[PDB]
Amino acid sequence: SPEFGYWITCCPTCDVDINTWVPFYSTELNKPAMIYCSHGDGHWVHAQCMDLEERTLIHLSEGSNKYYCNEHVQIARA
């Protein structure tokens, strides 16, 4: 179910579907890795849908920076 937050359509180009997904990152088991976007009220995106390389995803995860996804990072922030 999408209610657990993984098997969702995360963005207009999202390719992830529970019937066809396969592991891609070294840290994945049976669920896609995701990252939190701070735009608006916030939302989660699949890392692979953002075209994040593993090293980049891990660097983001180990740091304290907020993240803005590819759809929202270019929107001016008041």
């Binding site: 990152y25 989660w44 995803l57 740091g63």
Partner: peptide
């Protein structure tokens, strides 16, 4: 940044 499924676990 907050992430999910980014660490090895046991």
């Amino acid at each position: 940044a907050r992430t999910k499924q980014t660490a090895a676990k046991a």
